[PDB]
Amino acid sequence: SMEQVAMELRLTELTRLLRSVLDQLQDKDPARIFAQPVSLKEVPDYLDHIKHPMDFATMRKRLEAQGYKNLHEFEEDFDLIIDNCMKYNARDTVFYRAAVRLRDQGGVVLRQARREVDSIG
């Protein structure tokens, strides 16, 4: 139907905007701490601690399959990256501290993304 096409164009355009959002958030991680999944070869107990692992590469796979229906879903995955790290790693670590800085700097990007998503519809 023509309606289904219009919906699909809306999803495509959301995906475009989320791709730009993702690029901007990932620039706030210049150390690449969050770029890839935590390795279960290197951290064998990880899934005992963290039930829903997340990372920027996993988000990008979902994004490119158009698997985010709205900004809420995308933000849920970004918050998992941060929140998982702040639980597994202690306050005095470069990993925790990187997550705090990513959360703080990302907030700015996400605030305007929400306005754009609402504005453009």
Closest CA to 25 of 33, 68, 119: 33
32 torsion bin: left (phi>0), alpha (psi -120 to 50), beta (else): left
Q: HSE on the CB side for 22, CA within 13 Å?
A: 25
Taking every pair of Cα atoms in the chain, the longest distance, rounded to a whole number of angstroms, is 56
Domains in the chain, CATH or no CATH each: 1-121 (1.20.920.10)
Residue 29 CA to residue 101 CA, distance in Å, equals 8
Closest CA to 113 of 69, 79, 75, 82: 75
Closest CA to 78 of 9, 116, 29, 44: 29
Question: Please, which residues have CB within 8 angstroms of residue 80's CB and are 6 or more apart in sequence?
Answer: 52, 53, 54
Residue 22 sits at the vertex; the CA angle it makes with 16 and 26, to the nearest 5 degrees, is 150
Residue 78 CA to residue 34 CA, distance in Å, equals 10
**CB–CB of 102/80 below 8 Å?**
no
- Other Cβ atoms within 10 Å of 116 Cβ, number: 12
Residue 26 CA to residue 118 CA, distance in Å, equals 23
